[PDB]
Structure formats: structure tokens, C-alpha cells
Design a protein around this ligand. Structure first.
Ligand code: CLA
Ligand SMILES: CCCCCCCCCCCCCCCCCC(=O)OC[C@H](CO[C@@H]1O[C@H](CO)[C@H](O)[C@H](O)[C@H]1O)OC(=O)CCCCCCCCCCCCCCCCC
Ligand code: HEC
Ligand SMILES: CC1=C(/C=C/C(C)=C/C=C/C(C)=C/C=C/C=C(C)/C=C/C=C(C)/C=C/C2=C(C)CCCC2(C)C)C(C)(C)CCC1
Ligand SMILES: CC1=C(/C=C/C(C)=C/C=C/C(C)=C/C=C/C=C(C)/C=C/C=C(C)/C=C/C2=C(C)CCCC2(C)C)C(C)(C)CCC1
Lengths: 244, 56, 56, 137, 97, 56
């Protein structure tokens, strides 16, 4: 029943996390003497929400739902790392390597596109203490780093960039520079994002866990040219616990 | 290369600059020749060279 | 300075194809009869009346 | 300018004995370099790894030095990484991998000397063009 | 104010020496015996609080430590510049020939 | 001509501040590419002051 690439290709299932059947309400014993690792952490986002900025300071600044425009390019998959068992009984996922970032663009009402680097780069995420078995009440809370959406070689349409490019607006050779400084000086942001993985299904036999996530992070700031928005990402996850 | 700029005569006479953004900015002005202070505000000057009546 | 927008809103047309509504609510779908769809319907009607004017 | 003996005189070994190639030797080396090496090394660069070129100063800092004839001939027999630490014949053309790189099969020692001479003479001819890439075209 | 951090880092010892915390891996070609094997280990085990911390890399042969000792006068260490290490840019900074 | 006058002053014991402060502003202004009649544009309309600004 296991699928091949020619079955999957062009169906959109390659952007999906694997699922566990409804029957898998079991529990996975964490032997404290044995080490563990994560063979594959998948995260499939379903809902991207962006917080508006009402120009008033006060008011109800809630998260509005957006429309994805960059198609089924969104999931993080093949993420590996060590699942430590701590002293106090809690499990901490340290993220090592994988496809741990996807550029995503969503669009608000009015047509404003919001680019974001949807990521869990360098995710440290820990459970609660005294969890001797991963059950359906386990919650991996943690934080990750959000690097700049473009890296340092990226050139703007006027040829300006951080590690490459012009340092000024060459089409305006005698303009005053201080009003153009926020566009002329490219700045590499590095911010933090928070994520909570809630387990809903456990394969007690194999060691496959699945559930839902909620992730909060900043969107792209266009290398410092504008303020980033606050993004809330919701979706499903899948993790397979191999003992190491 | 530790590049500095010193000005002699004119408005910045005797002044020396060493911070690399400030030194680079006068170097981008020095490609045009002698460096002048302009009032760009009265005419909403766009910063883009125009020809003279000799050109027109 | 909106003049025809309230006349559309008075009779039911409140949403735009770009996703907003005039009451400011989020995430509702107007169907064809958005503000743009009204405007498109009037333009098409204008052209059809022009052709009928030529014929008559 | 002419292709004199002084142009055609390159180091033979690491000690410092020189070899003055013939114009027939240099022209045969250019033909065999085009035949066997220029698909990756056109102009002295390396298309599949631009970090390592064929400039004389770069071959000098290779381990063992490849900035003489015998160093280049040994590389064409048993190529290494730039520190000499790995043997890379299974991914680089050589005499010892002529079964997987079949253009290396009928290469003589006279052919390997001639290719090695072309690699050494050409930057003396072209200057920074050799190993420079598109900037110097 | 706003500053180009890459332009600023050329004002430090990064602009003169190979910076073990920041410099792209291909700059280890400039000296004999560092590339690829020692260059790979140096970038992998970055950051370092001093140049001499490069000799503490676990698994080095005594020949590998001697080569590093001959090249410490070409090395430096500065703070990790995130604009230089992100995007995998120490292994491929987008520059070829 | 600017460099000639500076060297004539510097040969006579003027300092570098004194040699360059003796150059007239009108002469330094001609040695600036924004006064070149070949730097303009066909649709860059108006006075040269509309470009770089009014020289102060
Ligand atoms: C010999 C002709 C001539 C020249 C060289 C000048 C020169 C000047 N004028 Mg003056 N001017 C002139 C006659 C002239 N003027 C005339 C006849 C009038 C009355 C309209 C004026 C009224 C006038 C005003 C009100 C102003 C000037 C200004 C200026 C200065 C700026 C010029 C500029 O920006 O033009 C820009 C030139 C163009 C954008 C080129 C026009 C190209 C045309 C539209 C293309 C035509 C294409 C054609 C239709 C295609 C045909 C195809 C067909 C055959 C098939 C410059 C010193 C300005 C100034 O600074 O004064 C202080 C200013 O404010 N002029
Ligand atoms: C009778 C009715 C006639 C109707 C007039 C028609 C108006 C349209 C004419 C075309 C518009 C000209 C475009 C200029 C636009 C404009 O803003 O200019 C406005 C510019 C003035 O420029 C203004 O100056 C101001 C302060 O002086 C400020 O700086 C403003 O920023 C600047 O726009 O005026 C001129 O262009 C007028 C002079 C034109 C000089 C002619 C040069 C000769 C060109 C010969 C080419 C002939 C080629 C023939 C090819 C066949
Ligand atoms: C591409 C498919 C190549 C062909 C054909 C040839 N070479 Fe090459 N060469 C290639 C690579 C990828 C590398 C780098 C290997 C590594 O260290 O990772 C090289 C390297 C060399 C060198 C060393 C350069 C230095 O700086 O020390 C030399 C001297 C060299 N290659 C010579 C050479 C010759 C003579 C060839 C024709 C027979 C030839 N190469 C073929 C890629 C390819
Ligand atoms: C500038 C300006 C402005 C604007 C204006 C406008 C916008 C206007 C327009 C207007 C218009 C837009 C109008 C039009 C008109 C039209 C008409 C008047 C028509 C007529 C027609 C006819 C005559 C027809 C004929 C015919 C035909 C064709 C066919 C069939 C038959 C017949 C015969 C019927 C404003 C005020 C804002 C401000 C100030 C300035
Ligand atoms: C139902 C409905 C509706 C309504 C609609 C309407 C309102 C319609 C209209 C319609 C119309 C309004 C029509 C018209 C038509 C027209 C035509 C059909 C015309 C044609 C013409 C012709 C054919 C002509 C020709 C010519 C010319 C052009 C020139 C000269 C010559 C001649 C004469 C030949 C609505 C939307 C509300 C809703 C839904 C339902």
C-alpha cells in the first residue's frame, strides 16, 4: 500500500504530513536510560494569520486570515534531531537539520502580500516534566530562530544589497541621502519565534506521533525597509521517534 | 585601506573625516568633480542632472 | 469624497473582490456582485446600449 | 611577441631543474588539453569547482606542489584534493581511472608532459586571463 | 543609525585575515594544506573565542595540528556576523569565478 | 587651472588651507559635472537647479 513518486507527483500530497489512523490513541514509553532521536519531523501549515496594525495605537488588533498565493510549497519536512531525556523527566527536541524553512507569501484583503520565512530553524522545544510516556496530552513548547527572509547577497531592483550591490540610489546622483537611508542600508534581521506542538495521536508500537501546531513569528521586513508583521501559523505535524 | 578625506578651502576647510560611510559619501560626490552644497528644497529638486541652455 | 459607493452600499453591495467589506469585517465573500462587479456590469451595459444606439 | 624558448621554459621538478618545451610540444599540449581537459578547465578555471583554478600560484600552494611538470604529471596519474589528503581518481580524470574516464586511456608520458607544459606556459602567455574567468575575457 | 555590517566587518581583522567564525570556506585555499579537509573541520566547529582554539578541534592528527600552527598568523576571530553565516553562506557565498 | 593656481600658491609658501581657500568658488563651480551640458535628459525638463538643487 506504500506509494511511489509517480503516484504522488503533481497531486499535492508531497506537501502533506503523514497521518496516523484514528485508532492510534496509544502511548510511547520513554525509557530514561536509553537515548532517542527524531527521524522525521514534518510540519504542514493549514492556516496563516497576520496581525493587523490599526493606526490608533489602541483598538482591537486581531489576527486576520489570509489567502496563500505561493501554492503547495509550504510544508517543512525531513527534520532530524536528538530527543533528549532530561533530569526532571521532560523531553527536549533539539533541531539538527532538515527542510526547516519555506518562503511563504499570503495576501490580505486589499491585496497586500505578506512574505514570511515559515521556519523552525534551530528549534529547541521541550515537554513538561515527569512524562515517562509520550501520550496524547504531551505538549512540546519551544522557540526557534527566524533569520532574514532574503540573505545577504540579495539585490533590490535598484541594485542595492547587504553583502553585494550598490550602497546608494545611483539613479538620483544628487539627491539628499538621509531620507533614502532606510532603503540604501540593507539590514539582516534575526528574530525569535515560538511554537507549541500538541500531540493528538500516538503510535505506541512504531513510535509515530502526530498532532497540531501553532507557531508565531515575524514576517519579512524587506532587509530593514519596513516593519515586519506578526504571523500566526497553524497546521498539523508528524514525528517519528527512532531510538538511537 | 583606512581611507580618510580632508577638505581645504570652502565650507569644510580644515575638517577631516574618517568614519567610512562619511568618507565614502564624499567620494561618491568627488566623481562629479568639486563638491558643492545644494538647496534641493526650494525647487523640489529631484537630484537628476539636467542640461544647460547651451545644451538646449 | 465617495459619491457612488454609498449608493451601492445602501442597496446591499458591500464587499470587494479584493476581500474587504464596508463594515470592515474580515473574510466574507461577495460573489459576483461586489463593487467591482457592479462597476463591470455597468460598463458592459454601457457598451451594449452603444451598439443598440448605432443600430437604431 | 613570439613563443620563444624563455616562454617555453617551465619547472620540471620541485628542486628547480627546468625543461624548455618545443613549440610542437606546446601546440600538442594545447590540442590534448582541449581534447581531455577543457570541458571543465577552459581558460584555466574549473567549471565544476570554481574555487580551484589552474593558475601557477594556485598549483604552487597545492600539496604536493603541482607547479612543475612532474607534479602535474603525477596529478594526471593519481589526482588528489588540494591538500593531498584524499585520492580523487574516481571523480577526476586520470591514468589510474581511464576505465571510467575513457579519454585518458591512450595518453602517453609524452602526452602528459605536453598537457602539463600547456598548463604552465599558458599563464606566462595570457597573464591574469588564465584562471580568471569571465572578468578577463 | 543604520550601518552595513558587512562593510563594517571589513574594517576589522576580517578584512585582513581569515576569520574562523565568518569567512567563507574557499579562502582556506590561500594557504597550503588547509583545504578541503582542515577547512571543513574549522567551519564545522566554529565559533572560536581565540585562534588557538582551532587546535582543540577533536580528532586532529599531529600533522593537522602542526599545519594549523603554521597558519595561526593568518587567522583571526571576530564576533559571528549573522549576515555572513546564514543561508549556508560559509560553504557557498554565491561567488564563483 | 585650479591645480595650476594651487601649485603657484604652494610654491610661494601658502599652506594647503591657504592655497585652496584662494581658489574662487566660481572657478570651482565650473569644475563640476552637474554644469556639463552633456549630462541632461530629453524629458528632464527645466532649469539645472531643478536637478542637483540651487548651489549654495
Ligand atoms: C529654440 C527653442 C527653445 C529652446 C532651446 C528653449 C530652452 C529652454 N526653455 Mg524655452 N520656450 C520656447 C523655446 C525654446 N526654449 C518656446 C517657443 C516657448 C513657448 C512655449 C518656451 C517657453 C518656456 C517655458 C514656459 C519654460 C521654458 C524653459 C526653457 C529651459 C528648459 C527647457 C526644457 O525643459 O525643455 C524640455 C524639452 C522637451 C521635453 C522636448 C519636447 C519634445 C517634443 C514634445 C516632441 C515632439 C514630437 C513630435 C510631436 C513628433 C512628430 C512626429 C510626426 C512628424 C510624424 C531651456 C533653457 C523653462 C525654464 O526653465 O525657464 C526659466 C520654462 O519654464 N521655455
Ligand atoms: C496652440 C496650442 C499649443 C498647445 C501647446 C501644446 C502643449 C504640448 C506640447 C508638448 C509638451 C512639451 C513637453 C514638455 C513638458 C513640460 O513639462 O515641459 C515644461 C518645460 C519647463 O520645465 C519646467 O520648468 C519649471 C521652472 O522653469 C520647473 O523646473 C518644472 O519642474 C519643469 O517642468 O517647458 C518646456 O519644455 C518649454 C520649452 C520647450 C523647449 C523646446 C526645445 C526644442 C525641442 C525641439 C524638438 C523638436 C523635435 C521635433 C520632432 C519632429
Ligand atoms: C571536469 C569534469 C574535469 C575534467 C574533464 C578534468 N578536470 Fe581537473 N579538476 C576538476 C575538478 C572538479 C578539480 C578539483 C578537484 C578537487 O580538488 O576537489 C580539478 C582539479 C585539477 C587540478 C588541481 C588544481 C589545483 O589548484 O591544484 C589540476 C592540475 C587538474 N585538475 C588538471 C586536469 C587536467 C590536466 C585534465 C585533463 C586531463 C583535467 N583536469 C580534467 C575537474 C575536471
Ligand atoms: C479635467 C477636469 C476634470 C475632469 C473632467 C471629466 C472627467 C469629464 C469627462 C466628461 C465626459 C467623459 C463626457 C463625455 C460626453 C460625451 C458625449 C457628449 C457623447 C455624445 C455622443 C454622441 C453625440 C453620440 C452619437 C451617436 C453615435 C456615436 C452612434 C449612434 C448614433 C448617435 C448619433 C447618437 C474634473 C472636473 C474632475 C476637475 C477639473 C479638471
Ligand atoms: C436579466 C438579468 C439582468 C439584466 C440584464 C440586462 C439589463 C440586459 C441588457 C441587455 C442589453 C442592453 C442588450 C443589448 C443588445 C444590443 C445589441 C444586440 C446591439 C447590436 C447592434 C448591432 C447589430 C448594430 C450593428 C451596426 C453597427 C455596430 C455599426 C453600424 C452598422 C450596424 C447598424 C449594422 C441582470 C444583470 C440585472 C441580473 C441577471 C438577470
Amino acid at each position: 500500500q506504500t506509494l511511489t513518486y509517480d503516484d504522488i507527483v503533481g497531486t499535492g500530497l508531497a506537501n502533506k504530513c503523514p497521518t496516523l489512523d484514528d485508532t492510534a490513541r496509544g502511548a510511547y514509553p520513554i525509557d530514561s536510560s536509553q537515548t532517542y532521536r527524531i527521524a522525521r519531523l514534518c510540519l504542514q501549515p493549514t492556516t496563516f494569520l497576520v496581525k493587523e496594525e490599526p493606526k490608533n495605537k489602541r483598538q482591537e488588533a486581531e489576527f486576520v486570515p489570509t489567502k496563500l498565493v505561493t501554492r503547495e510549497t509550504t510544508s517543512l519536512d525531513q527534520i532530524q534531531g536528538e530527543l533528549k531525556v532530561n533530569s526532571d523527566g521532560s523531553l527536549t527536541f533539539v533541531e539538527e537539520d532538515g527542510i526547516d524553512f519555506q518562503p511563504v507569501t499570503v495576501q490580505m484583503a486589499g491585496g497586500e502580500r505578506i512574505p514570511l520565512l515559515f521556519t523552525v530553524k534551530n528549534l529547541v522545544a521541550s515537554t513538561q516534566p515527569n512524562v515517562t510516556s509520550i501520550t496524547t496530552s504531551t505538549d512540546f513548547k519551544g522557540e526557534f530562530n527566524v533569520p532574514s527572509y532574503r540573505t545577504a547577497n540579495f539585490l533590490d531592483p535598484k541594485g542595492r544589497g547587504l553583502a553585494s550591490g550598490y550602497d546608494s540610489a545611483i539613479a538620483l546622483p544628487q539627491a539628499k541621502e538621509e531620507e533614502l537611508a532606510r532603503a540604501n542600508v540593507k539590514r539582516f534581521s534575526l528574530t525569535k519565534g515560538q511554537i507549541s506542538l500538541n500531540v493528538a495521536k500516538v503510535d505506541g508500537r512504531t513510535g509515530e506521533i502526530a498532532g497540531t501546531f501553532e507557531s508565531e513569528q515575524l514576517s519579512d521586513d524587506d532587509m530593514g525597509a519596513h516593519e515586519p508583521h506578526e504571523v500566526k501559523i497553524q497546521g498539523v505535524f508528524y514525528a517519528s521517534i527512532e531510538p538511537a | 585601506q583606512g581611507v580618510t578625506v580632508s577638505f581645504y578651502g570652502g565650507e569644510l576647510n580644515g575638517q577631516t573625516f574618517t568614519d567610512p560611510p562619511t568618507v565614502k559619501s564624499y567620494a561618491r560626490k568627488a566623481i562629479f568633480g568639486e563638491i558643492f552644497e545644494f538647496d534641493t528644497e526650494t525647487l523640489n529638486s529631484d537630484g537628476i542632472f539636467r542640461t544647460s541652455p547651451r545644451g538646449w | 469624497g465617495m459619491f457612488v459607493l454609498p449608493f451601492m452600499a445602501r442597496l446591499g453591495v458591500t464587499g470587494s473582490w479584493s476581500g474587504w467589506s464596508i463594515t470592515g469585517e474580515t473574510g466574507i465573500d461577495p460573489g459576483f456582485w461586489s463593487f467591482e462587479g457592479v462597476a463591470l456590469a455597468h460598463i458592459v451595459l454601457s457598451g451594449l446600449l452603444f451598439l443598440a444606439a448605432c443600430w437604431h | 611577441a613570439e613563443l620563444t624558448p624563455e616562454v617555453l621554459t617551465v619547472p620540471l621538478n620541485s628542486e628547480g631543474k627546468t625543461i624548455t618545451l618545443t613549440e610542437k610540444q606546446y601546440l600538442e599540449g594545447k590540442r590534448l588539453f582541449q581534447y581531455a581537459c577543457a570541458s571543465c578547465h577552459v581558460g584555466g578555471i574549473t567549471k565544476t569547482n570554481p574555487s580551484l583554478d589552474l593558475r601557477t600560484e594556485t598549483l604552487a600552494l597545492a600539496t604536493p606542489p603541482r607547479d612543475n611538470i612532474e607534479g602535474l604529471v603525477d596529478y594526471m596519474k593519481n589526482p588528489t584534493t588540494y591538500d593531498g589528503e584524499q585520492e580523487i581518481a574516481e571523480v577526476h580524470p586520470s591514468l589510474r581511472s581511464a576505465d571510467i574516464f575513457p579519454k585518458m586511456r591512450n595518453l602517453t608520458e609524452k602526452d602528459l608532459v605536453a598537457i602539463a607544459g600547456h598548463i604552465l606556459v599558458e599563464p606566462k602567455i595570457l597573464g591574469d586571463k588564465w584562471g580568471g574567468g569571465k572578468v578577463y575575457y | 543609525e543604520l550601518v552595513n555590517v558587512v562593510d563594517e566587518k571589513l574594517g576589522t581583522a576580517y578584512g585582513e585575515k581569515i576569520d574562523l567564525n565568518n569567512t567563507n570556506i574557499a579562502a582556506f585555499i590561500q594557504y597550503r594544506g588547509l583545504y578541503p579537509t582542515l577547512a571543513k573541520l574549522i567551519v564545522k566547529n566554529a565559533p572560536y573565542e581565540s585562534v588557538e582554539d582551532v587546535l582543540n578541534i577533536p580528532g586532529l592528527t599531529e600533522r593537522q595540528k602542526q599545519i594549523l600552527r603554521e597558519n595561526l598568523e593568518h587567522f583571526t576571530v571576530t564576533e559571528v556576523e549573522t549576515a555572513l553565516v546564514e543561508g549556508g553562506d560559509r560553504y557557498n557565498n554565491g561567488l564563483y569565478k | 587651472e585650479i591645480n595650476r593656481r594651487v601649485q603657484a600658491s604652494l610654491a610661494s609658501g601658502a599652506t594647503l588651507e591657504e592655497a585652496w581657500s584662494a581658489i574662487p568658488e566660481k572657478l570651482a563651480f565650473y569644475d563640476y559635472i552637474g554644469n556639463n551640458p552633456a549630462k541632461g535628459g530629453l524629458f528632464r525638463t527645466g532649469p539645472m537647479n531643478k536637478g542637483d538643487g540651487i548651489a549654495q
